[PDB]
Structure 1
Amino acid sequence: TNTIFKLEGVSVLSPLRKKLDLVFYLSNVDGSPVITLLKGNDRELSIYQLNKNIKMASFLPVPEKPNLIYLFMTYTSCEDNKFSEPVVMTLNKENTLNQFKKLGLLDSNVTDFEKCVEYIRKQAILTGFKISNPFVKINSFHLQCHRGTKEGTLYFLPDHIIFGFKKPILLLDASDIESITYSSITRLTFNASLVTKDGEKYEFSMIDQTEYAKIDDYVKRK
């Protein structure tokens, strides 16, 4: 098969939590792209025909850790139906640059990790899918809140809201939101409940008061 690039020792958080090698390659059979996560020569996870089976993929910031970045993907199905939770991995920026240099993909004097992100995004497009990068012209933002007892990060992206990354990770299409309701309103915090077109209600609690304006604006976006 035709291997395009590989990254070793990537920290995968979902749908399993292991350090794994990432291989991106093109199928022998029809040229469609494949990603597999390897431990030795064992395939722990594989997703075929990424041009058909990736529903959404994005690079996302890691709160308070500018030296790292998440690569997040949702998929329709995977090899042997092993998993359903989204792929989330953590890349160390400097590590990634160094591996790209060793593979000959970037010159040794390149210092900007955004060159790695550009290469990976172009590779997706050449193979027929898209990886977004909303935090590098619509303004995306993220904040910490709770779903019940579990803390997590709520990312507001141009067409999606994501709450992560404890199981089960939540992705909502922005165009599916019908309304927002605020409750438990206090000086420092409030709760917001997003109701979707299908009538489902998603409640996020203990959101900082400073986030109200951006969230209220986001839901009213025309």
Structure 2
Amino acid sequence: TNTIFKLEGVSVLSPLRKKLDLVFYLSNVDGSPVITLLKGNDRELSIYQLNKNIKMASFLPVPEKPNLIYLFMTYTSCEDNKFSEPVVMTLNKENTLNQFKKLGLLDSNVTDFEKCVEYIRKQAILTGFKISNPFVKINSFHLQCHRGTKEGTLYFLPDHIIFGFKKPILLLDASDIESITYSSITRLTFNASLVTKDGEKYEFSMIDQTEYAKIDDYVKRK
């Protein structure tokens, strides 16, 4: 089989929480790309034909941890229907650079992790899908809030909103948002309820009051 690249000892959070080895390879059958996540020789997760099965994929910042990055991917199905929740992995930036150097993908004098991101994004286009990098000409933002008693991170991306990363991880299409309603408004926080075109309602609470303008602008985009 044609292996394109690998990363050893990646910290996967969803749809399982385990350190796993990532292998990106092309199927011998039709050349379509595959990702598999290994523990020893055991394929814990595999997603085939990424060119058809990845619904969205993005690099996302880890709040308060600039040395790390998330790679987030949603998929139509996986090997043996083992899981449905989105793939969320944490990459250590410097480790990724070190691994890419040892695979001969980057020169030893390269110091910018964004060169790793560039490589990975180009491997996706070469194989028929797209991994975005919205935080590196539209302004994306993220913030901490609750979806009840549990804190999470709300990401506002050009085409999607994500609330992560405890189960169930929420992904909404921006174009599906019908309205926003503000409630429990105080000097410190407000609550926001997003209603989609299908009439469904998504309630977020305890958002810092300073986030109002960005959120209101976002929903008014277009």
Task: Give me the TM-score of the superposition, normalised by structure 2.
Answer: 1.00
Instruction: Please give the secondary structure, in 1, of the residue aligned with 2:77.
Output: coil
Instruction: Please give the secondary structure, in 1, of the residue aligned with 2:162.
Output: strand
Instruction: Please give the secondary structure, in 2, of the residue aligned with 1:191.
Output: strand
Give the paired residue count.
Answer: 222
Runs of 4+ that moved beyond 3 A: none
1:153, CA displacement in angstroms? 0.2
Instruction: Please give the secondary structure, in 2, of the residue aligned with 1:118.
Output: helix
Q: Who is 1:49 aligned against? A: 49
Q: 2: distance between equivalents of 1:12 and 1:165? A: 11
Instruction: Please give the secondary structure, in 2, of the residue aligned with 1:171.
Output: strand
1:38, CA displacement in angstroms? 0.2
Q: What are the within-5 Å matches in structure 2 for residues 1-222 of structure 1?
A: 1-222=1-222
Once the two structures are superposed, residues 57-89 of structure 1 have per-residue CA deviations (whole angstroms, 9 ceiling, x without a partner) of: 000000000000000000000000000000000
Instruction: Please give the secondary structure, in 1, of the residue aligned with 2:109.
Output: coil
Structure 1, unaligned stretches of length 5 or more? none
1:6, CA displacement in angstroms? 0.2
Q: 1: distance between equivalents of 2:208 and 2:13? A: 26
Q: 2: distance between equivalents of 1:155 and 1:98? A: 29
% of aligned pairs identical? 100
Instruction: Please give the secondary structure, in 1, of the residue aligned with 2:6.
Output: strand
Q: 1: distance between equivalents of 2:64 and 2:187? A: 25
Once the two structures are superposed, residues 128-158 of structure 1 have per-residue CA deviations (whole angstroms, 9 ceiling, x without a partner) of: 0000000000000000000001100000000
Instruction: Please give the secondary structure, in 2, of the residue aligned with 1:112.
Output: coil
Task: Give me the TM-score of the superposition, normalised by structure 1.
Answer: 1.00
Once the two structures are superposed, residues 104-125 of structure 1 have per-residue CA deviations (whole angstroms, 9 ceiling, x without a partner) of: 0000000000000000000000
